[PDB]
């Protein structure tokens with residue numbers, strides 16, 4: 001059962017979830033995606049949309065990560081083209097101080113020294129948005145057009161035991 | 176005709192070249208490498224070893240780039256394992272504000288927004304060192320042991336028309 005990653009012309013995400021970082025023990029997510037679209041947002045996350053945020057998307061058909069926090073600020077593309085209309089397995093893992101991206105079972109990117117332990121300075125509420133950003137696309141380090149005409153399935157996001165809230169699922173469209 | 180990327184126990188590079196950045200028109204390099212060694216430095220470059228430097232190497236058999244300048248500071252791993260004893264084609268290209276890494280004809284990494292135009296503030300003399308760093312390994316963002324027991328061939332470095340000096344080639348060892 002797959003859901004569309006874009007619902008109409010607007011750039012708003014199709015789903016938002018909120019997590020308690022003080023309770024999280026699983027810092028990875030996994031999903032399958034299929035698209036003919038070379039550009040868009042797969043997911044966005046933040047503890048503060050001004051000061052601590054990240055984005056996984058596609059640009060020129062390839063994975064792109066942008067992130068901005070006090071440890072690191074970067075815009076990186078990596079991995080194979082995903083816009084070939086086949087299902088691809090994606091996993092994003094925060095391990096130690098590093099973020100790992102795996103595509104179809106292969107590690108394609110490791111961003112080192114981009115994260116740290118949870119400090120009382122870090123706001124302990126993390127949002128995850130699917131298919132869109134929680135700020136205007138112009139606040140990205142490198143703007144793109146967020147709409148991603150693709151399908152998502154088999155998706156697991158961080159640690160369900162730490163989830164505080166999730167948007168209503170009746171706004172979702174089956175593929 | 177290939178040359179060894181490590182000459183003895185010391186960590187010093189096997190070759191150094193110097194370029195005039197005011198004259199450079201080709202900002203890419205290409206080479207083939209073969210190694211069973213999972214860790215080490217392939218090349219290092221700088222305009223200032225304190226303030227503006229970069230490194231391409233291997234860690235856990237995979238390409239790693241570290242760079243440190245006023246625009247960007249990062250430590251990133253990407254691409255396939257290269258420590259399988261086969262020759263691999265590598266190309267590193269500075270294009271616009273981005274650095275591209277290609278391995279065996281495939282783009283595996285694009286670091287965006289890491290470079291800018293040549294400004295009078297930027298020291299216009301760039302050094303490139305092969306097989307070692309031009310500072311102690313402890314000054315890396317993430318230390319590694321620089322020695323890379325591998326072989327290098329078919330190597331072209333930046334723009335030979337901008338080259339000011341190059342170390343003596345009789346210190347090189349054939350593979």
Ligand SMILES: c1ccc(-c2[nH]c3ccccc3c2Cn2ccnc2)cc1
Pocket residue numbers: 027028029045054055056065066067092093094099115128157158
């Ligand atoms: C690009 C850049 C950073 C991240 C990121 N920052 C994090 C901060 C805290 C916990 C997990 C993560 C993840 C990993 N993550 C987030 C949702 N699913 C996995 C993710 C993608």
Ligand SMILES: c1ccc(-c2[nH]c3ccccc3c2Cn2ccnc2)cc1
Pocket residue numbers: 202203204220229230231240241242267268269274290303332333
């Ligand atoms: C990792 C990070 C940065 C770079 C880099 N910074 C540069 C600054 C000015 C011109 C070319 C380059 C290159 C590209 N380059 C340098 C030698 N051969 C190609 C290279 C590797």
Ligand SMILES: [Ca+2]
Pocket residue numbers: 037038039040145146147148149
């Ligand atoms: Ca799109």
Ligand SMILES: [Ca+2]
Pocket residue numbers: 212213214215320321322323324
């Ligand atoms: Ca080594």
